[PDB]
Amino acid sequence: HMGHIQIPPGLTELLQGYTVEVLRQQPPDLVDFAVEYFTRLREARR
Amino acid sequence: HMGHIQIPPGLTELLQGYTVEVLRQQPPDLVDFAVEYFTRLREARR
Amino acid sequence: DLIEEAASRIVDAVIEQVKAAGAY
Structure with a gap:
């Protein structure tokens, strides 16, 4: 009944938190930082 | 003013890419996939 | 595809924030 394609929410809310710290910390390279952020998040989930 | 800069671009093309990878593979957990993409970015050139 | 439209917005x-942080 009425089919189509959509996008899962949460992606924007996630980058939003990242976009913030990126400016507050103002690191030299965001690459390594991006890896240090998400990688650290896993520590939160058990 | 010759001393008022604090907004280096680059985060645009980078984030957009993540939007095309997460939507193409559509992994079950983005948290882990996030650490996989960026972490590999460190070996793309620098 | 549609992703190029939802990922573009x-x-x-x-x-809108990273570029509007060094101005206002």
Whole structure:
């Protein structure tokens, strides 16, 4: 009944938190930082 | 003013890419996939 | 595809702050 394609929410809310710290910390390279952020998040989930 | 800069671009093309990878593979957990993409970015050139 | 449209607007929001931080 009425089919189509959509996008899962949460992606924007996630980058939003990242976009913030990126400016507050103002690191030299965001690459390594991006890896240090998400990688650290896993520590939160058990 | 010759001393008022604090907004280096680059985060645009980078984030957009993540939007095309997460939507193409559509992994079950983005948290882990996030650490996989960026972490590999460190070996793309620098 | 549609992703090129939803991923193009999502970026417009993040850049709206990173670029508007060194001005206002």
